[PDB]
């Protein structure tokens, strides 16, 4: 969907259009910590866990029927 912006919003610095050592980031959540040697360690307690129950045999549906039944 096309939406209107200001033409002055092109001046905000982004790492795609910056020198090679510019870092901004995209507000992702962190999962670990930086090392002193330029690496990274992923702490497994900070990873998201998803609780998705079993959907097989469920009787409800995305839409509700609109057949003429009663006032």
């Amino acid at each position: 969907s096309f939406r209107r912006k200001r033409a002055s919003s092109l001046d905000i610095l982004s790492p795609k259009r910056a020198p090679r050592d510019f870092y901004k980031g995209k507000n992702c959540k962190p999962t670990g910590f930086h090392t002193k040697k330029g690496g990274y360690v992923v702490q497994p307690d900070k990873l998201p866990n998803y609780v998705i129950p079993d959907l097989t045999g469920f009787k409800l549906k995305p839409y509700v029927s609109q057949c003429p039944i009663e006032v």
Partner: protein, 44 residues
Amino acid sequence: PKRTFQPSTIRRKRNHGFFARKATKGGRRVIARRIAKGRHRVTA
């Protein structure tokens, strides 16, 4: 011939950036003047 504008993004942000203007009393008046005028680009 070598012209006068030789671009460098880090130099531009270090001289006319938001936190470079916010650091001294003259630049804070510049920011107030720009906002009062109504400029779209308040800082460089």
